[PDB]
Amino acid sequence: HMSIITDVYAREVLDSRGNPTLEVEVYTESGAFGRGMVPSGEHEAVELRDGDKSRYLGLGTQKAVDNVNNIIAKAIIGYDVRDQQAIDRAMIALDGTPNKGKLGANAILGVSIAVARAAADYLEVPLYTYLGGFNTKVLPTPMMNIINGGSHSDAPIAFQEFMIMPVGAPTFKEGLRWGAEVFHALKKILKERGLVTAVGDEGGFAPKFEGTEDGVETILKAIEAAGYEAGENGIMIGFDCASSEFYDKERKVYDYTKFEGEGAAVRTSAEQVDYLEELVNKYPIITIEDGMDENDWDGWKVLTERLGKRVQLVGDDFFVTNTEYLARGIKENAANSILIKVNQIGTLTETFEAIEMAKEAGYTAVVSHRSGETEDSTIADIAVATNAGQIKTGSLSRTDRIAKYNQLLRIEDQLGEVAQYKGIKSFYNL
């Protein structure tokens, strides 16, 4: 039979940081072919690294490759390419450990994506429709990393990302246009101001700003210089605080002096909500990723209680694309959104279960990328697959980001008049 998987093959390659990762290629009997590349950035499914400090600083992925070829290959070769779920469970079972540590979630995912991309090819249909069935129409309102703080910046800013969103644009094409044009308008401002216009891991700037206020304030300046409004009818802001980064576990506080230098405001759970609340009043923020630590459940509860109805609140690391942690989130009214990083969980099925569960709680599934990305564009299709309405794939520079933006332009076009773009209406959690 022609649908049947006859080859599965991995090799080591580079992600967009200059670090190894892997691709898996799957052939069917028929000639059909798919290529699954894997990205890379605690409760998060393990990615296998060689540890050999004399190869790529021990970030080699030969371990992973050798598991795809010598173990997963033999097990999987034989299945029908379309048994997307039979296969993902095979690998999971085969692996046997809860956080995919035996074979590694890079190995597993790789295969799993390859097989889908192969099956979509086999049936001679786009990836989003294979994945999603026939009712895939919605193009994601994207949230575009434009300024960086935290580890990435040297400026006195703790929040890791500052993003934007063309919620007010009619089509995703225009939305991207909008988004780009501001990025160039900002880039200009940053030159006139004498700050660094080189870009970090997600294609954003990370300039030496005065602090968090100057940070937002200029993103707004940019928006206006481009000639868009700053609201529901224009462009709006978001954060990834990555607060788990500046949380002191023993003092159980949000230590801003780590990133904003001595004489900076150390905050408790309650104060932290109050700051974020301030920010939201002051500004047209619409989303806030990791407002809190990944083990600060009480905090999360309160945060979401306060802004839960004004502002979309996304648990990134607080859920790790993982049903177990998310169900608890739902139960305890812990967020109203979730960041869906496919490699964080390891297979597409588990990824879809996660995206599914979240919808039925009135939680938005934000499909996201990882810092270490690839020429792959699978996640773009995943946001259309599920009509998720949202996507975080980075800034408007570096093909690691723009591959997806293009990929989505492709999907917009291929969908002709069928395509929708929900802008602000994608926030069914509000």
Author numbering: 0 to 40, 45 to 433
List sentences from the manuscript.
To provide the foundation for understanding the structural basis of the virulence function of GAS SEN, we determined its crystal structure at 2.9-Å resolution. The asymmetric unit of the crystal contains two dimers, with each subunit exhibiting a kidney shape. In the crystals, the octamer is made up of a tetramer of homo-dimers and consists of two types of interfaces. Dimerization of two enolase molecules involves the ‘major interface’, whereas octamerization occurs through the ‘minor interface’. Each major and minor interface buries a total surface area of 3648 Å2 and 2580 Å2, respectively (calculated by PISA), with the octamer having an approximate diameter of 153 Å and thickness of 54 Å. BS1 is located in the minor inter-subunit interface. Plasminogen BS1 is located at the C-terminus, while BS2 is located on the catalytic loop L2. Wild-type SEN binding to immobilized human Glu-plasminogen occurred at a slow rate, and the dissociation was similarly slow and did not go to completion. In the presence of wild-type SEN, the initial rate of tPA-dependent plasminogen activation significantly increased by more than 20-fold when compared with the no-SEN control. The initial rate of phosphoenolpyruvate formation was calculated to be 131 nmol/min/μg of recombinant protein.
SEN has been proposed to contribute to the virulence of GAS by serving as a plasmin(ogen) receptor. Although SEN has the ability to bind plasmin(ogen), it also catalyzes the conversion of 2-phosphoglycerate to phosphoenolpyruvate as part of the glycolytic pathway inside the cell. Alpha-enolases are typically homodimeric, however they have been found in some bacterial species including GAS to be octameric, consisting of a tetramer of dimers. Each subunit is made up of an N-terminal domain (residues 1–143) and a C-terminal domain (residues 144–435).
